[PDB]
Write a protein that binds this DNA or RNA. Structure first.
Lengths: 137, 77, 94, 58
RNA sequence: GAUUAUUGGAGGUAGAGCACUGUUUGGACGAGGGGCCGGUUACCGAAUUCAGACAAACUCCGAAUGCCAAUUAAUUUAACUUGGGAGUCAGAACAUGGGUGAUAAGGUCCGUGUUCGAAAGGGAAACAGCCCAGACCACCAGCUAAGGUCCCAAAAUAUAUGUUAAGUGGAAAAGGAUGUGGCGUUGCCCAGACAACUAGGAUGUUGGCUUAGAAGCAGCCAUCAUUUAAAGAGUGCGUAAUAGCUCACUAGUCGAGUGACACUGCGCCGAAAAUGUACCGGGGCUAAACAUAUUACCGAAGCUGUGGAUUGUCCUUUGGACA
RNA sequence: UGGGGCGGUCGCCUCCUAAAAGGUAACGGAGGCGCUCAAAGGUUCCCUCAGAAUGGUUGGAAAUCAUUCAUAGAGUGUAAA
RNA sequence: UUUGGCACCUCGAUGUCGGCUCAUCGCAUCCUGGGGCUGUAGUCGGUCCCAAGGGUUGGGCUGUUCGCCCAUUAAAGCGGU
RNA sequence: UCUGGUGACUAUAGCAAGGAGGUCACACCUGUUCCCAUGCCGAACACAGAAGUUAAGCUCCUUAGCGUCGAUGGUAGUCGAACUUACGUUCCGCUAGAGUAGAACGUUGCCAGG
């Protein structure tokens, strides 16, 4: 359900997946976070599912930040029809993440609770993940 | 259907002579829209914003200030 | 607060740098007033222990060849994906 | 001063830039050789096409 | 003309970044509507700020390489002009940069290279496009390339050091587990660790809301002294409630090894399709697999050796020197 | 013309695709032209943004008026560069 | 094994659907066989595992593939060629 | 060799703040008779003066406060090659941007007075 209020161009090139994370690789707002380890697209429904599963386990407790927004639309032809009569209609919205990228941050809750909630979130996602804390030293 | 199948004929813009070569007294040096490159010594500026040499010599691209560039021609021979 | 350092010779290539990082070492620089700029290597574990005992913003009297220099940490390049340090800049406060 | 160059690998399956560099060095067939004095230009040609040649001082 | 070296120059890609454009996440701040009498209270949209993110049609920045050209220097041999004669305008795969498609197609459309087309030979089991390499002709001569050396079937059942125990090798994934190696960090102990024996399990106390009574348990606890070397207004089996023996403790015996993290290399499961073993090519292999090194040998129409045609560029020896 | 048909399109200009020279395809992604001007042309002199608050008769809160920052975010007949 | 996408063989011809006759293979098991768990008292049933040896009906309305119904059956399996 | 006039250098030159100065110069200053002028106005321009001031502009000095410039080392990306098919690895070369240390509160040519 997350998406932008408006975009200049509705149809865009599909992004690139090679490389490492340009930014967003450190927890800044909270105490604990879920870092990505592989590359993929996240489709704006996966985020919702993970946020719900991570919220209800904390039971209106701490605080959760989503460090990711799907800015990029992707198209789809509805029925498998002939190739090439123009580009299709928008179907959803995606964000691209590369290894190093932080996806979710949490604070105001214990470490074990954070671990379990982020595990439940990770099982709703198409990418391998890893629990991490604030950097020191 | 679609409604995006249009484009214009590409115009052959850009540099036509290089820094350091000899040229004659009416040769074109740089075709562009507006002034990416300004004219300098013995260099003109046409109605199409085209840059041309007034005299025969070697062509030198050089800066103008902090963020601008020009061409010049010098008659050493 | 008594670290050691070995001076890197000239023209370290990618391969030797990553061999040095496969080993427990890490590249570093020392600059500031009192000395010229020198490129060295340091043991990651010993550097971590010194930081644990002294603090992030603390002084270290580390040894460079013949002499010793009081020095503070300016910046450090860190690899969050495998949680190891990959470069460290030292600033001579004197 | 003097270098013996020898073409060890063939020139086919390779790009035209490398082919023309090999031609400029004076090599035609495989295991053919040439003698030339040492200059940084010759060294640049060699460094371009080193995966195809073998060089020795002589 | 071509390649390289040294120089000069045009340019805005990859990457980075947020200084413009737009998109976005938290947080503050205080102003306008607002909840009210023209106002408090909360909530809205905007501005300014703090820190973080995004971009083919954003750029304060900005490569590598390619492009143009030089008094240009070194090696090579093309280049241009005019004219006679053509054929061609169905292209294919591979690798890489991209659009499209569904980060599908032996798909389709462009760009940069190679090969086939029009290219035999050796390897990839067989296999136009993959790897090696370009066949003038003889030879029962030799050196190598890619790929290989148990038998099929030429060459190491070679040396040295390890890993694996599944025939992995010789079909994938999310996830799940120990099965072993390696690298660190760190803690556990003759004041005897880690199992396991048994020896204690409490009580004023469910004290209180006392909830179907409940006295480890409708669910909120108030979760206090401690018989004691040592135990909890009960870890915990429980429980209609109790019955609770210990996994809350320790002298006692055990008399010596012991766990956590990370990171990592190999392996296991997940793993079902149809004529007949059925992708190691087959036999068969625990090295004849994998990994790292070293040294030998094999291996092509490649190179060399010997002889022979034919023709071209020079000397002008037109020899046929070199090709 | 990813068989043909129905549908759509057929010339020109500007961006992106386009891989930092130029060029470069698709029934790839976005938009415009088929003019206008006797001053909106030539020359000589002069002049210089919005927006923002500030604050006030008016007040649309902002129209006009006034001080200061603003870096072209002003404006440039007509799309985009 | 579907509906499709591509357009690689075949347009100097590769027989289209049902049904009959005749089979053959796989297992992702309809019956029979053996087992674990059960919110399995027994009778039974549900789910999962092993397993492919054999067997797996006749009629009405349907061109009908498909489907509904009548009566049985230990069962009236799903697919490929 | 102080000031001024006029030119060349990518703001290392600017912006901001603080402190001093003046009839050799510079300027605010007085007024609209005349030249000339303001889609109103001597605000501006132009004209005639020098009563007054250093306040402002301008000059000098101080500060790295904002802006500007900015290495070293390291990284990303990438040419070539070799593994290979992994959202890759390895070797060689070029070495970014950002950030950090740091620099800088201008250099200088010609001319006349002084």
């Amino acid at each position: 359900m997350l998406l932008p209020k408006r975009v200049k161009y509705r149809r865009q090139h599909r992004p690139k997946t090679t490389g490492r994370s340009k930014g967003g690789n450190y927890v800044t707002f909270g105490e604990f976070g879920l870092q990505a380890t592989t590359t993929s697209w996240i489709t704006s429904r996966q985020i919702e599912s993970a946020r719900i599963a991570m919220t209800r386990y904390m039971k209106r407790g701490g605080k959760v930040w989503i460090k990711i927004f799907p800015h990029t639309p992707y198209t789809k032809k509805p029925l498998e029809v002939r190739m090439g009569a123009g580009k299709g209609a928008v179907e959803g919205w995606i964000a691209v993440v590369k290894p190093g990228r932080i996806l979710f941050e949490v604070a105001g809750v214990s470490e074990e609770v954070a671990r379990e909630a982020l595990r439940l979130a990770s099982h709703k996602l198409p990418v391998k993940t890893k629990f991490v804390k604030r950097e020191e030293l | 259907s679609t409604k995006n199948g249009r484009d214009s004929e590409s115009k052959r813009l850009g540099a036509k002579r290089a820094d350091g070569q000899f040229v004659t007294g009416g040769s074109i040096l740089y075709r562009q829209r507006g002034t990416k490159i300004y004219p300098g010594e013995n260099v003109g500026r046409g109605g199409d914003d085209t840059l041309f040499a007034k005299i025969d010599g070697v062509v030198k691209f050089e800066r103008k200030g902090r963020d601008k560039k020009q061409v010049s021609v010098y008659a050493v021979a | 607060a008594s670290l050691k350092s070995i001076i890197r010779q000239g023209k370290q290539t990618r391969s030797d740098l990553k061999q040095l990082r496969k080993s427990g070492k890490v590249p570093a620089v020392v600059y500031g007033y009192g000395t010229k700029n020198v490129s060295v290597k340091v043991d990651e574990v010993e550097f971590i222990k010194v930081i644990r005992e002294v603090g992030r913003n603390g002084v270290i009297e580390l040894g460079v060849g013949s002499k010793t220099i009081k020095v503070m940490v300016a910046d450090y390049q860190f690899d969050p994906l495998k949680n190891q340090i990959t470069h460290i800049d030292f600033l001579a406060i004197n | 001063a003097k270098l013996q160059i020898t073409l060890t690998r063939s020139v086919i399956g390779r790009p035209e830039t490398q082919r023309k560099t090999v031609e400029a060095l004076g090599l035609k067939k495989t295991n053919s050789s040439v003698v030339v004095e040492d200059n940084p230009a010759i060294r640049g040609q060699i460094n371009k096409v080193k995966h195809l040649v073998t060089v020795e001082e002589k």
